[PDB]
């Protein structure tokens, strides 16, 4: 069965839109699940003794919009109070209520498809024995898939994927590669090199395909406790070419950080 | 002419809201075009032989909200079935239908401003000769302009702009610069240096303005097949200063990767 909503009703009766249908629609438009909120303090909440007064705050919980207009929540002293918006559709006259709780008791209850009380924490209010010491809002999560953007400003941080690889390059050289965003690689040199000539391919493992650059990358390294240096080339095929001086039978400790981009312009 | 919707209609005749007007509003709020969807399986679809039963799935296509409640789609065996939502506004009683097709036949038809049937693929269901082997959803695209965000988590990748520049710095030295996000630069050294003294400005081309740093950047390089190194300074004014030892008539191959930031804290 297909149940249609955003469609015209020729005889004004065909497609009635329920509050739960709009709830689900709104959740989908904003990219919210039942474990987050949309919240806006149009005016600042006021703290008086062990109470928080929401003067003019709008909340969207489970795609349901409501307003807190001079709504006071009594708080527990010397405690971290978790402020919840609770939606119980069976309480027909007053389906929404606020509570101050000892823990984040957000339950992710699907109120738009089934029965149950939705509880969702939106504020954290810390108290002393006399009043509010600090308030921290709960994060409003936007769950999106693929984004096309022109400009972005981040005040906190962006967490991107990280992949790691250890390569036993041969001749005693060990590379520890860390790739972030599938593009930026930082190579950390370890081990001790011996029995190699300039221009020669190293005798060990080639770099795994996911860490191979599109163009040859020359990475400078240093010999620990010496004034001497070397460089290696990570070739697009994964091979590593030695470009330091010829090294004899005696191993020399190799260290240093070198960076490269995997991707070119496109 | 101006057509108003989210406004008071004193006589309940002025600003009635059409389904296409809400469709466009919803598309604008979520940042969707006609080539994507908003989709949520509130309960898991069920696979039975060559059929997919959508138990409780909500879809937004062209800003139009509808629900699939125990709606079964018959599948082609030993095939990759592309599941489509098809919207035909002329079919007033049943404007939405589902189809299983041999290709992604999404047509991007503007149903809110023009005529036509909107076809949009939302699921990919692969079958054997007897039933479903795998299911993959179609990506939900968010087309945005300028974003202000506190924190972000990326599970895939961020694609940022890339600019490249080759500089014939003089004395046989060649720099290949790759700039990403208009900030991070990785310099790759090439060529072979000769006839230069420490502290001397190199005899060739200065770095183009878009690659110039705010502060002097010292980039370490290596001499191929040797245990010797050098460094160059990329000055904010665009000039390059040699800071290796004095080089005679015989050129020595220069290689290595060095990174710098164009922008400081601002």
């Amino acid at each position, epitope marked *: 069965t297909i149940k249609n909503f955003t469609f015209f009703s020729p005889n004004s009766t065909e497609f009635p839109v329920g509050s739960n249908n709009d709830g689900k629609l709104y959740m989908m438009l904003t990219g919210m699940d039942y474990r987050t909120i949309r919240r806006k303090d149009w005016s600042s909440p006021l703290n008086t003794a062990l109470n928080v007064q929401y003067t003019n705050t709008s909340i969207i919980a489970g795609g349901r919009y409501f307003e807190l207009l001079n709504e006071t929540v009594a708080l527990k002293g010397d405690s971290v109070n978790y402020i919840h918006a609770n939606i119980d559709l069976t309480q027909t006259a007053n389906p929404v209520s606020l509570s101050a709780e000892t823990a984040n008791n957000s339950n992710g209850v699907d109120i738009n498809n089934g029965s149950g009380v939705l509880k969702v924490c939106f504020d954290i209010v810390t108290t002393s024995g006399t009043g509010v010491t600090s308030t921290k809002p709960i994060v409003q999560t936007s769950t999106l898939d693929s984004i096309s953007v022109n400009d972005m400003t981040v005040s906190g941080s962006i967490d991107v994927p990280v992949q790691t690889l250890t390569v036993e390059a041969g001749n005693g050289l060990q590379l520890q590669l860390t790739k972030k965003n599938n593009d930026l690689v930082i190579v950390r040199f370890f081990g001790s090199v011996s029995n190699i*000539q*300039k*221009g020669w*391919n190293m005798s060990g493992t080639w770099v795994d395909r996911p860490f191979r650059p599109a163009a*040859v990358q020359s990475l400078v390294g240093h010999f620990a406790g010496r004034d001497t240096s070397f460089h290696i*080339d990570i070739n697009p095929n994964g*091979s590593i*070419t030695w*470009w330091g001086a010829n090294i004899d039978k005696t191993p020399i400790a190799t260290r240093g950080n070198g960076s490269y981009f995997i991707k070119s312009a496109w | 002419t101006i057509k108003n919707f989210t406004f008071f209609s004193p006589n309940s005749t002025e600003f009635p809201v059409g389904s296409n007007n809400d469709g466009k509003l919803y598309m604008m709020l979520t940042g969707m075009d006609y080539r994507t969807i908003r989709r949520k399986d509130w309960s898991s679809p069920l696979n039975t032989a060559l059929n997919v039963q959508y138990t409780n799935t909500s879809i937004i296509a062209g800003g139009r909200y509808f629900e699939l409640l125990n709606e079964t789609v018959a599948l082609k065996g030993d095939s990759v079935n592309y599941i489509h939502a098809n919207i035909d506004l002329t079919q007033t009683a049943n404007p939405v239908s589902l189809s299983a097709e041999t290709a992604n036949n999404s047509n991007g038809v503007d149903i809110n401003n023009g005529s036509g049937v909107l076809k949009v693929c939302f699921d990919i269901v692969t079958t054997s000769g007897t039933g479903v082997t795998s299911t993959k959803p179609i990506v939900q695209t968010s087309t945005l302009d300028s974003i202000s965000v506190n924190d972000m988590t990326v599970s895939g990748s961020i694609d940022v702009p890339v600019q490249t520049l080759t500089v014939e710095a003089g004395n046989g030295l060649q720099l290949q610069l790759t700039k990403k996000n208009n900030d991070l630069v990785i310099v790759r050294f090439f060529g072979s240096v000769s006839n230069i003294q420490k502290g001397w400005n190199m005899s060739g081309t200065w770095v183009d303005r878009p690659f110039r740093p705010a502060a002097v950047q010292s980039l370490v390089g290596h001499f191929a097949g040797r245990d010797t190194s050098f460094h160059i300074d990329i000055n904010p004014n665009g000039s390059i200063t040699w800071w290796g030892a004095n080089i005679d008539k015989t050129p020595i*191959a220069t290689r290595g990767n060095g990174s710098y930031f164009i922008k400081s804290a601002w």
Partner: nanobody, 122 residues
Framework: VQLQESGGGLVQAGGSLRLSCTASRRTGSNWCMGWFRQLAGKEPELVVALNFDYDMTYYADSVKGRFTVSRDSGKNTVYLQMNSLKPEDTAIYYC????????????????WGQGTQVTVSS
């Protein structure tokens, strides 16, 4: 990939011979073109090679100061001009090409030649 050899033939001890080799394309960075040789029914050895990207040559101790590797400029062509040719150097010279620098391992070479025979009398 594909290689096109030239030169070879006979010459007396203390004489001179020239080898030519052209590669159809380059497989990548650290592009090396050289020759391998199998002397008196023994394992092959990388006699000579040239790193195009670095303009660095490699010569095995046995051929040092006699054999000279040159490149034909812009084209992917390598020449081997050998002087003071001795009867121990009587072997079949196989042209080799690869991306990733010099290597003793035959497998690691992307391009392998048919082989050009060099014969020198006592």
């Amino acid at each position: 990939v594909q290689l096109q050899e030239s030169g070879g033939g006979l010459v007396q001890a203390g004489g001179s011979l020239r080898l030519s080799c052209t590669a159809s394309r380059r497989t990548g960075s650290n592009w090396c073109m050289g020759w391998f040789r199998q002397l008196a029914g023994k394992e092959p050895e990388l006699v000579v090679a040239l790193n195009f990207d670095y303009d660095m040559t490699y010569y095995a101790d046995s051929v040092k100061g006699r054999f000279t590797v040159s490149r034909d400029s812009g084209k992917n062509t390598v020449y081997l001009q050998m002087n003071s040719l001795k009867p121990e150097d009587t072997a079949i010279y196989y042209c080799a090409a690869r991306s990733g620098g010099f290597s003793s391992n035959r497998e690691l070479y992307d391009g392998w030649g048919q082989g050009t025979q060099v014969t020198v009398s006592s």
